[PDB]
Amino acid sequence: SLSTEATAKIVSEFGRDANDTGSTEVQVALLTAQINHLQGHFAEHKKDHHSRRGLLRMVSQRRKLLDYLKRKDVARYTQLIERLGLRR
């Protein structure tokens, strides 16, 4: 799991204020950071099906959150994706 310091840094960098962990942008940032961290582990192992299932679950959650954010506000979504470099 992501370290406490990493989560705090992500919240500070993305949250609009303190204790803004529930914002969609913060959730997307945490999910993408975890996905990036786990990519190397999966490449190293490539046989952890159970962990791959958890990775797929978080990827699906991030996609759903991104779709909801795009529907609610185009500007926020288009800024978040370029900041995080998603949606190639």
Added chain:
Amino acid sequence: MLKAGVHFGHQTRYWNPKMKPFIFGARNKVHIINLEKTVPMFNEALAELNKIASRKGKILFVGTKRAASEAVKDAALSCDQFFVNHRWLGGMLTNWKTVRQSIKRLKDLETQSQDGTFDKLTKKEALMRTRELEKLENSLGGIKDMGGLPDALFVIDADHEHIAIKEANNLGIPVFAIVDTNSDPDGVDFVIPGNDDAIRAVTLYLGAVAATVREGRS
């Protein structure tokens, strides 16, 4: 300390969910029945019993309990009514024709004993026959008086004697039963949140109902 305020209660741990409002709660690890809210319904039952006795109904008593056998027999003899001191025979009400045949046979044997059985034919065989029939004579002490057809019942328990309640319900005979705190109150239409232990309490209850019925004829 009223009449119902003396007994402590029953139903230590296991309870019947049907009679939820009839229990005050759990006190000193043992549930207590709604003693305060017990006297009105009992009075109503007594009034109904008095109404039944207005026509001199054939209200029966069940004495299946050995400890309470004499406790209910005294009330039965005081009211000169029918009672069942021994085990309640299955089908007494539903199969009353068999009981009628049995009591008719008993009456015929009793009438003919003084003439034929004594010394007309034999004595040893007659003595053995009389010894065998003494238990039958003892059984059905009160129910053998008239043709039966009871209009009510006063069984002292429900779970133990559910057969009588079921028979009465099948025949549509109201039952003024003192349902136990862990019995099934569905069968009894006049459920009385009383107690089964504390022989003194049940003795007081039967004495009170006997007194009420005695003066119920006006």
Added chain:
Amino acid sequence: SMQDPIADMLTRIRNGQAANKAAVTMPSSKLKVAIANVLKEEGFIEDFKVEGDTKPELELTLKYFQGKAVVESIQRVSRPGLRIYKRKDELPKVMAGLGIAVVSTSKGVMTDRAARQAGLGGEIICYVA
């Protein structure tokens, strides 16, 4: 519940009636309040009350004339995924008029008799008998 609050409240009423419960509680809503008012107006229930503002809760008091339940049957008619609409000239009749069918017309929620009298069709919420 998560997809049919009306069916959920109808089910709650049926279960409470079968369980011999004095009253039942559920989340409150405008349509639920209107249905409860219509049911009370016809005597199917004793009374209904709403408690709270942020998270309103609707409480309905069941009625028992005798040992048997007054609400013999209650069945949802129009449900999500299959909507039922009837014209004023073909409104449903429950138990040859002995029952009550809830109809939502342009004038609000009312019994089938009221809708027929007003000559307005609508959506058949449910049958109550």
Added chain:
Amino acid sequence: FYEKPTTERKRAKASAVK
């Protein structure tokens, strides 16, 4: 098989204990 006897023994779990 070397596994069937184990299953047979485990079948007696409900004999008289529960």
Added chain:
RNA sequence: GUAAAGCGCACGCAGGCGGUUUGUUAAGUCAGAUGUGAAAUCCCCGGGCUCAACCUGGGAACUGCAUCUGAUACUGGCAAGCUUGAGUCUCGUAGAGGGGGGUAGAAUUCCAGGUGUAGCGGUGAAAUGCGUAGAGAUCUGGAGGAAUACCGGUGGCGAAGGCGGCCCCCUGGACGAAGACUGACGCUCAGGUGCGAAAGCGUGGGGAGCAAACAGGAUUAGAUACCCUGGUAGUCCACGCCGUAAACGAUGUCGACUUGGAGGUUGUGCCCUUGAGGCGUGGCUUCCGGAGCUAACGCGUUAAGUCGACCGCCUGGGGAGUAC
């Protein structure tokens, strides 16, 4: 669930459905009006054949479509909201959850040495087999592969298949206390994608024990068949393929409501935790049983009870899950 029928399991696109307030939009829906819906035929009230069939006048009907005018409770679209659904953050808890690398003890087999000497092994009884070039037994070293006794439990974890020595590294999920945050972001899913016991296949290793095939012994007039002695794949590893099970709880996933007892296993709050205890409050799980349900068996708050959303599947037995 057992009569035919729940995909082996999961993720998820299209699609179907979707918590609670308002605002107006009037698409669905509803009300009225108008135009049309050929005549004949069906139906109702009548008439003419002496009655009937048959013919015929007027209606009704043609359940439909289109346009206009209105109502808008409900559903839908648009704009704001709300926190109960669903999620994020903080602390802590148990776990054979998964991947990788180490290491430990017992045991089997083999190799070699010492002591020792005729049997050992096997069976219902035998024989094949091993042994004087010294077996088996006992001891003492070494090599190797495979699996983890006791704990161990109607115990625990995992979506399913499945997961048992100990330690380390990486990693997934679930649960509990108290808060803060986002504000419907949800449910289900045809196709699609992924996972998926054992056996099997391709390449290259490994091979102790087990063991299809096979060899021999015994039995029989001769066989086959169990039985015995051996024994090759296979079983193990790395990669790739196979995608099948009585893959079962013969019970699809999600949410709500509905009498109760007896446990097991993990949390957590309070009372002298004095402690094991009592009082409560959660998650998972086993058994009995009420209403209700069921053809009965039986299920029974973990429903096969009362409902709602969506998906899959079945409608005689054989042919046949076979042919093309």
